[PDB]
Amino acid sequence: APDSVDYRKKGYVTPVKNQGQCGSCWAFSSVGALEGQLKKKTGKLLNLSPQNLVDCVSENDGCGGGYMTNAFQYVQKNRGIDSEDAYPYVGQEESCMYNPTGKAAKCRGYREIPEGNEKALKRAVARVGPVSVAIDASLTSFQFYSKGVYYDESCNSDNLNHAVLAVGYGIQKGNKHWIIKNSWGENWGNKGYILMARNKNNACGIANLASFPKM
């Protein structure tokens, strides 16, 4: 595995989205991982539908939260997920209206990174591409983040409450980090992104609930 890799520079990552006032971070995280696997398989980069997931994943709770693995399982069983255009995002729960004509990707299962193993997460990001992860993003310091490598001692690895996407890893002036795509628009953080401490005892629980879809 390389010392540093950034999948944004490989054309694997779509623009940063804004989830608005709906607890749908898990859907944006899932779509992000699926988008990366689609680029690798087909050569094409396109926006897939978070709304499809919000409405249709019955084992999740819509705008009230959910798990990424449940979203990958749904896409597999359903044998498809719509593009953003065929099932646009409205930031509220509605009845499931999957449109088979708008199908833009599929899923053939998912795999999980060994809990807490940051080296296994590094090797997965390096081998597979963007990986869905869960973190403690409850701190005020996370909310107002601007630039640099994010670390806060009061972050709790047991309190996973926010779903994001790891689009790579690296080292910024001696400090090892994960490159993290958020879903709060381009005006949050650094153009929608945050660098989070890597190899600092699994800070904010970055490697506690990581997974990627298979295609």
Ligand X SMILES: *[C@@](O)(C(=O)N[C@H](C)c1ccccc1)[C@H](CCCC)NC(=O)O[C@@H]1CN(C(=O)Nc2c(C)noc2C)CC1(C)C
| Site track for ligand X across 1-20, x = CB under 6 A | ------------------x-
Greatest Cα pair distance, the chain, in angstroms, is: 49
DSSP for residue 16:
P
CB of 19 to ligand X, least distance (A): 6
Active site residue 25: yes
Active site residue 201: no
Please pick, from the candidates 163, 167, 179, 197, the single residue that binds ligand X as defined by CB under 6 A.
163
CB of 160 to ligand X, least distance (A): 5
Q: Pull the structure tokens for residue 197.
A: 């401490």
Strand partners, 29: none
Give the residue with the Cβ less far from ligand X, 124 or 134.
Answer: 134
Active site residue 162: yes
> How does DSSP assign 159-193, residue by residue?
---EEEEEEEEEEETTEEEEEEE-SB-TTSTBTTE
Q: Do the beta carbons of residue 181 and residue 16 sit within 8 Å?
A: yes
CB of 106 to ligand X, least distance (A): 23
- Which residue type, as a one-letter code, is found at position 187? N
22 binds ligand X (CB under 6 A): yes
* CA-wise closest residue to 200 among 138, 148, 162, 157: 157
Q: Do the beta carbons of residue 141 and residue 151 sit within 8 Å?
A: no
Binding region for ligand X (CB under 6 A) out of 31-39, 50-58, 149-157, 161-169: 161-169
Helix (H) / strand (E) element for 81: namely strand 81-82
54 binds ligand X (CB under 6 A): no
66 binds ligand X (CB under 6 A): yes
Strand partners, 6: 168
203 binds ligand X (CB under 6 A): no
Q: What residues between 105 and 134 interact with ligand X by CB under 6 A?
A: 134
Q: What is the three-class DSSP state of 140?
A: helix
What are the catalytic residues? 25, 162, 182
The residues that touch ligand X, with contacts defined as CB under 6 A, are 19, 21-26, 64-67, 134, 160-163
